Amino acid sequence: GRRTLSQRKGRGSIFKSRSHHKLGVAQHRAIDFFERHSTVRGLVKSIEHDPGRGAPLARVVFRNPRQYGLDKELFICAEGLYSGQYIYCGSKASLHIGNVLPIGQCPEGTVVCNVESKPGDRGIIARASGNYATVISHNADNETTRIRLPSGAKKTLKSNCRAMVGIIAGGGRTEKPILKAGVAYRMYKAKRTTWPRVRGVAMNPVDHPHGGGNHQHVGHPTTLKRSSPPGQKAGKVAARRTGLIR
Amino acid sequence: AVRVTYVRKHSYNTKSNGIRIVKTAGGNMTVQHRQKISNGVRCGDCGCVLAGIRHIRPHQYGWLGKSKRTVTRAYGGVKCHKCVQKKILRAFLINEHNLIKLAAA
Amino acid sequence: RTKKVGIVGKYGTRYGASLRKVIKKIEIAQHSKYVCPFCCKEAVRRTACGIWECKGCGKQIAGGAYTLSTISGATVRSTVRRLRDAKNSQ
Amino acid sequence: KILAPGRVVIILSGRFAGKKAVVSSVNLQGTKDRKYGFVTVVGVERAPLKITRKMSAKVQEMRTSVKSFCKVINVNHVMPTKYTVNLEQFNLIKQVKINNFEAGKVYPISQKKAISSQFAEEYRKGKESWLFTKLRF
Amino acid sequence: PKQVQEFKQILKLLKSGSIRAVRVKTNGENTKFKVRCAKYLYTYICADKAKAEELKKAIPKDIHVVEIAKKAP
RNA sequence: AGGAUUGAAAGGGAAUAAGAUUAAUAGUUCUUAAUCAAGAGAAAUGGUAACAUAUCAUGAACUUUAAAAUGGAGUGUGAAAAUCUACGGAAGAGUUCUCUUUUCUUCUUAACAAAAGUAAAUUCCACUGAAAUGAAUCAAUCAGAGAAGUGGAAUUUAUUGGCUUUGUAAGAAAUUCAAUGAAUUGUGGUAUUUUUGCAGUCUUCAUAAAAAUUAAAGGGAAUCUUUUGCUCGUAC
RNA sequence: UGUAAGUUAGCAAGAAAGAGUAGCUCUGGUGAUUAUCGAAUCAGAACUUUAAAGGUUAGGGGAAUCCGACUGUUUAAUAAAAACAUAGCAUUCUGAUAAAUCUAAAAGGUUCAUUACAGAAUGUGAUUUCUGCCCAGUGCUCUG
RNA sequence: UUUCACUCAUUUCGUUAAAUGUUAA
């Protein structure tokens, strides 16, 4: 048959990201001595709206500690930040909302966000709206600490991985029911080309494996092995279970 | 009523293609090319439109007299009068507190 | 004016009684003014999803999608204060 | 009394914003023509510049020179400090009264240079420092 | 085109060496002295004949003087 | 110092208009009148303040800010033009054996600058300190982080400075008359539409470009006349 | 003027149904400036006739049944629909050196300027009410 | 052969390759 819609998605055609009005890459600043063995102070100049993402972005401004000028950064807002607030980033920073601390200095039970999976990689985990990761325990024997990811999974990271103390702003975004197809159309203004999704059973046998006959149905089980080739991998993949959960 | 025509070769109602119809000798109407509306300066901190500076194109500020493109004050073209009073108080008060708290407490 | 459909009368009769009920609570809380934590004025209005601006005070605050401060965002702030005091004291 | 002759203030507004001034005469009530509580101040309009031992003696003289100003300023536009100069040392300041200030006309240039030299020669002796060091906003 | 407001400027203009030509226009209610300089065309609206004759004696003799009336030249 | 090429005759962009002219080209020629860019011949005052001064009144490296440069809807309103209309006319034309102090046409003005007179809206400054709470909009909205009042400053309103007015400029152009030469070219409207701005209000799980280029600031290093403006498109 | 059953209480609804409307001569209401000036709009009364929206422009209405909830899209040139989309509901995998996936290869590429309120793969199709029993067969999975 | 310890090939990253490690003050 044809190449299904999932195959056509990996080619980088019209399915490219609609990132033209985006503000930029949101991350911590690059690690240095003044962050490893001191604290640098940042000023939250403004809080802006980055298209395509649900959380506001803070236009933080630091001072260059080795040369003359400014280090205009772009952080992800923690809930409660306000314009003109001072935020301190470093190993000796105080445990306040918005401060950037290595994950080893946070007491067990601290709620953090924008955590680095690897030291110095400028933020990976807990970046969506209203999300956060909790610190579970420390292990000074091998300099590793345990955190609980927003998916519930537990992850062990190095004790010098940085994080922002608090909650990502914009929580409760997905609790408001979209009511109209027009509203969902505007949701993907700064996203990829995915929205109007035709059911595979409404397709033809050439287009999709579900492309059916005289009655709209599937015909074969929709739970498939992980090793299925691209093209026939349509439906539920490696499904340990199905049906409504109890 | 006298109807007019575009004088330049642009034929679309674009932002730079603004025209004005004015009357002339004999009742004829001619077409002028009018100028876009610009914005002024804003305080570097509070983002308020500064007073005393015209709202013209960036290059026309060069034609203006030296005194008409700024205000005679500290920072005088980048900060409002309120924006500067805060700057002076912050500098003096914090240095004074840094003088009494530390530095022979 | 209306018996019970207060703000969701603009949706007419075409989205479902339950969905119009759920969207009503959110749309009231999204459009209302909140007490502004730095100057104690009912002058904070939402400017974007998660950005709130004190009208008569000149401050921009990051908050919830539709409410200035979320329930989960308030317990976390309280929790950190307890953790910080305990760390600062022994 | 916060505002008394000899008290050092810092101007908050106007062309002379951020300049350090010394109070001469105080009037919290205001005259007929002045409908505001005002004070007449003499201050350092241009702060002296630092000098090294590589420049000639004439360069050190002009680099340490101080340009001063005399102005009637509202008491709501000056922030008083905790420093007070001795009006006996700066005797020329004592002659700056409200009558000396006329509306719309240039303040006498000869008077300003006389105070400027007194400010400069006093600073060259280093006896007064905080008045002549410049404020960095 | 610029306008000269009173008498002192035009005489100083006339004695100035930047002048190029002079044209005198007689209207029904006034007389205009358009001095054609290098850059601009200065004019002076006059309503008193005696002041106009004083002006007419003030033009240097070498300058081409144009007299304009109800018929254009 | 920081990142190579190309990519828009609808995005950004230094600077021009009126009249006349040809069988045909004209923001391109002619007359008149302008503008722009690149050249040539111990360092200022005033105002309480917001801020203001025909160049003035020094301002390097380095850094920052702003402009270029930002959705849409709906309501109110400033100004111009068109149409309509009020008063006074000047010139020409049509109807007229039934009347009609009548019906119709013309009565205009550019770029660029000036500053007699005089507006609307918004934002700030000084004095004062609001409760018996006031101020205000079609709607709102606002106030002891200071309302209302009085007096000021600034910006916007299709170039200078928005409108009338002035220079250009009546010498042009229009309507008549004579056979090239002669005449006139007021003042208004609590009316409609269009255009262009302004002020707040509503809406977004939508927040609605970048650079060339320009100016200002912090810092204190150093001690008017005239010339030229090339390449290509331009008919229909 | 009057307007029903039904209803998600918002609608149905311009429901349905009835009356008036021309010409001429008048009267009154709605303001500004401090007597003068001005605006189209509304209401009312005598009289007349060929009894008046109708030159032109300009909704037929009601009672039910089936399907799709709705606005939208569709076989350019015989199918415009009950078909597709839709919001809502539900399920599966993935902690990013991942999931899906393009390439012959690749310090190669897309979602991703992203980080579980996210990315990818599917079924049903608003709301209300409810989703019963079956793990034998074929799939999928197992922390075995 | 299995379980260990290291890094030195190898992978994945980050910066203006801007104070890494150990002494010293």
PDB file of C-alpha atoms in Angstrom, chain E:
ATOM      1  CA  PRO E   1      10.400  80.247   0.609  1.00  0.00           C
ATOM      2  CA  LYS E   2      10.881  82.334   3.756  1.00  0.00           C
ATOM      3  CA  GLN E   3       9.279  85.591   4.884  1.00  0.00           C
ATOM      4  CA  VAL E   4      11.076  88.627   6.294  1.00  0.00           C
ATOM      5  CA  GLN E   5       9.022  90.133   9.094  1.00  0.00           C
ATOM      6  CA  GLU E   6      10.329  93.695   9.542  1.00  0.00           C
ATOM      7  CA  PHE E   7      12.471  96.282   7.795  1.00  0.00           C
ATOM      8  CA  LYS E   8      15.846  95.751   9.474  1.00  0.00           C
ATOM      9  CA  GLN E   9      16.379  92.240   8.091  1.00  0.00           C
ATOM     10  CA  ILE E  10      15.728  93.023   4.426  1.00  0.00           C
ATOM     11  CA  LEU E  11      18.175  95.943   4.315  1.00  0.00           C
ATOM     12  CA  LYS E  12      20.847  93.810   5.971  1.00  0.00           C
ATOM     13  CA  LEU E  13      19.888  91.127   3.453  1.00  0.00           C
ATOM     14  CA  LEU E  14      20.190  93.624   0.591  1.00  0.00           C
ATOM     15  CA  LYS E  15      23.608  94.833   1.747  1.00  0.00           C
ATOM     16  CA  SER E  16      24.673  91.202   2.172  1.00  0.00           C
ATOM     17  CA  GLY E  17      26.638  89.783  -0.745  1.00  0.00           C
ATOM     18  CA  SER E  18      24.674  86.533  -1.113  1.00  0.00           C
ATOM     19  CA  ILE E  19      21.888  88.168  -3.146  1.00  0.00           C
ATOM     20  CA  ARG E  20      21.245  87.064  -6.726  1.00  0.00           C
ATOM     21  CA  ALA E  21      18.135  88.835  -8.049  1.00  0.00           C
ATOM     22  CA  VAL E  22      15.220  91.023  -6.967  1.00  0.00           C
ATOM     23  CA  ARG E  23      11.638  90.996  -8.251  1.00  0.00           C
ATOM     24  CA  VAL E  24       9.047  93.528  -7.074  1.00  0.00           C
ATOM     25  CA  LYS E  25       5.366  92.595  -7.283  1.00  0.00           C
ATOM     26  CA  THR E  26       2.654  95.246  -6.932  1.00  0.00           C
ATOM     27  CA  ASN E  27      -0.638  93.852  -5.650  1.00  0.00           C
ATOM     28  CA  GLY E  28      -3.931  95.652  -5.175  1.00  0.00           C
ATOM     29  CA  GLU E  29      -3.362  96.118  -1.442  1.00  0.00           C
ATOM     30  CA  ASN E  30       0.363  95.510  -0.837  1.00  0.00           C
ATOM     31  CA  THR E  31       3.810  95.286  -2.418  1.00  0.00           C
ATOM     32  CA  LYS E  32       6.070  92.240  -2.074  1.00  0.00           C
ATOM     33  CA  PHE E  33       9.874  92.353  -2.323  1.00  0.00           C
ATOM     34  CA  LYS E  34      10.989  88.838  -3.261  1.00  0.00           C
ATOM     35  CA  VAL E  35      14.768  88.675  -2.881  1.00  0.00           C
ATOM     36  CA  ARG E  36      16.090  85.660  -4.789  1.00  0.00           C
ATOM     37  CA  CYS E  37      19.065  84.448  -2.762  1.00  0.00           C
ATOM     38  CA  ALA E  38      21.259  81.393  -3.308  1.00  0.00           C
ATOM     39  CA  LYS E  39      19.087  79.038  -1.235  1.00  0.00           C
ATOM     40  CA  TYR E  40      15.718  80.606  -0.360  1.00  0.00           C
ATOM     41  CA  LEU E  41      13.384  83.248  -1.790  1.00  0.00           C
ATOM     42  CA  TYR E  42      12.913  85.826   0.955  1.00  0.00           C
ATOM     43  CA  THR E  43       9.909  88.129   0.644  1.00  0.00           C
ATOM     44  CA  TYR E  44       8.676  91.186   2.527  1.00  0.00           C
ATOM     45  CA  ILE E  45       5.037  92.293   2.473  1.00  0.00           C
ATOM     46  CA  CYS E  46       4.865  96.092   2.393  1.00  0.00           C
ATOM     47  CA  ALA E  47       1.818  98.361   2.494  1.00  0.00           C
ATOM     48  CA  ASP E  48       3.409 101.828   2.885  1.00  0.00           C
ATOM     49  CA  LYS E  49       4.608 103.393  -0.362  1.00  0.00           C
ATOM     50  CA  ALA E  50       7.241 105.596   1.289  1.00  0.00           C
ATOM     51  CA  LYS E  51       8.857 102.547   2.885  1.00  0.00           C
ATOM     52  CA  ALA E  52       8.711 100.843  -0.521  1.00  0.00           C
ATOM     53  CA  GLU E  53      10.537 103.735  -2.199  1.00  0.00           C
ATOM     54  CA  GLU E  54      13.146 103.579   0.562  1.00  0.00           C
ATOM     55  CA  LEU E  55      13.451  99.881  -0.276  1.00  0.00           C
ATOM     56  CA  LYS E  56      13.685 100.626  -4.002  1.00  0.00           C
ATOM     57  CA  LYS E  57      16.648 102.927  -3.371  1.00  0.00           C
ATOM     58  CA  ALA E  58      18.252 100.148  -1.306  1.00  0.00           C
ATOM     59  CA  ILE E  59      18.659  97.668  -4.185  1.00  0.00           C
ATOM     60  CA  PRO E  60      22.207  97.724  -5.607  1.00  0.00           C
ATOM     61  CA  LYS E  61      22.242  99.025  -9.159  1.00  0.00           C
ATOM     62  CA  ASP E  62      24.059  96.011 -10.635  1.00  0.00           C
ATOM     63  CA  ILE E  63      21.241  93.630  -9.672  1.00  0.00           C
ATOM     64  CA  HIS E  64      18.713  92.699 -12.341  1.00  0.00           C
ATOM     65  CA  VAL E  65      15.399  94.040 -11.016  1.00  0.00           C
ATOM     66  CA  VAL E  66      12.154  92.520 -12.309  1.00  0.00           C
ATOM     67  CA  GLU E  67       8.937  94.545 -12.165  1.00  0.00           C
ATOM     68  CA  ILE E  68       5.791  92.399 -12.075  1.00  0.00           C
ATOM     69  CA  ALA E  69       2.247  93.692 -12.499  1.00  0.00           C
ATOM     70  CA  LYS E  70      -1.178  92.410 -13.545  1.00  0.00           C
ATOM     71  CA  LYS E  71       0.539  90.918 -16.623  1.00  0.00           C
ATOM     72  CA  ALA E  72       3.228  88.349 -15.888  1.00  0.00           C
ATOM     73  CA  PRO E  73       6.566  88.790 -17.722  1.00  0.00           C
TER      74      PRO E  73
END
